[PDB]
Design a protein around this ligand. Structure first.
Ligand SMILES: CCCCCCCCCCCCC/C=C/[C@H](O)[C@H](N)CO
Lengths: 22, 278
């Protein structure tokens, strides 16, 4: 397991067949 | 005779079903409707085939004979005091064609007689109203030789006495064919020539039989002759009634030539028009 916490507001700052008729 | 089917709405189609493609070699006419090839709306049909029925098609009085008679004097050899007319629809073309649309027919008949008379000269006096005798002579019955011979007693022959100036005379006849239907066409002979007998014997006209033998009409003026000659014409109008028909045929395309299917003239009925000319 690992722990992730976001420290910012904006989410950008978060870590990453043949016959046919038509 | 009854109402036609309605038209159902058709949208776009994309499938392996191809009503357009067919094979006429089978002899079967493709029963397509507009909705099969193009997009169609819904139309509640109100047209009917009531006037296309076989009854409507033949429900008209058609002239078939103009019989000419005279009232001049027995001495006059140029005046025909009585006239015999073999009963047939082939003396006129229009009814003949409408009938020969079909091989067989079966119907009652209505005969209407329109009689018109006139003077032929002026300086011989005038005439009184004429009575005409129209005697039906079935085959085998004695045929008048004179305008006033015993045959006109009509003890058994049906006879119509028409007073000039009265409305056109009219009678009805049931289906009187010795067969089960009238034969518009008879692909055969009345006699079969037999090996051995002379070429004179056994020879019969092609297509002629006793199926179409119906007797004749003998028309005379019953009155004695006035000092002036009077010429009369009886027009016979035939109306089929209760018509049944069988085996439709292509209609006559070229002028009739005689009682049979013979043709001699007017063999080029179609005009000239360009293949790519609208
Ligand atoms: C009252 C005396 C004079 C009027 C009576 C004449 C009666 C003749 C009726 C029987 C013969 C004609 C019957 C039908 C004629 C043809 O067969 C049809 N057009 C056949 O299609």
């Amino acid at each position: 397991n690992y722990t992730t916490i976001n420290y910012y507001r904006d989410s950008a700052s978060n870590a990453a067949d043949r016959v046919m008729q038509l | 005779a009854n109402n036609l089917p309605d038209t159902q709405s058709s949208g776009p189609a994309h499938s392996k079903e191809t009503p357009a493609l067919t094979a006429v070699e089978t002899g079967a006419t493709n029963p397509l409707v507009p909705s099969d090839t193009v997009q169609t709306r819904h139309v509640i049909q109100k047209r009917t085939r009531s006037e296309s029925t076989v009854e409507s098609f033949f429900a008209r009085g058609a002239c078939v004979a103009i019989i000419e008679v005279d009232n001049d004097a027995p001495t006059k050899r140029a005046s025909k005091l009585f006239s015999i007319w073999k009963i047939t629809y082939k003396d006129t073309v229009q009814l003949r064609r409408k009938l020969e649309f079909f091989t067989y027919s079966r119907f009652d008949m209505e005969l209407t007689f329109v009689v018109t008379s006139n003077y032929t000269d002026a300086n011989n006096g005038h005439a009184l109203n004429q009575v005409y005798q129209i005697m039906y002579i079935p085959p085998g019955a004695p045929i008048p030789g004179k305008w006033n011979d015993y045959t006109w007693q009509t003890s058994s022959n049906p006879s119509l006495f028409y007073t000039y100036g009265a409305p056109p005379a009219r009678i009805s006849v049931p289906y009187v064919g010795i067969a089960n239907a009238y034969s518009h066409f008879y692909d055969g002979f009345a006699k079969v020539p037999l090996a051995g007998q002379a070429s004179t014997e056994g020879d019969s006209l092609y297509g002629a039989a006793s199926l179409n033998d119906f007797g004749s009409l003998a028309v005379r003026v019953v009155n004695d002759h006035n000092p002036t000659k009077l010429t009369s014409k009886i027009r016979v109008y035939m109306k089929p009634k209760h018509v049944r028909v069988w085996c439709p045929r292509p209609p006559r395309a070229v002028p009739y030539y005689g009682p049979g299917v013979d043709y001699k003239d007017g063999l080029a009925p179609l005009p000239e028009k360009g293949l790519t000319t609208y």
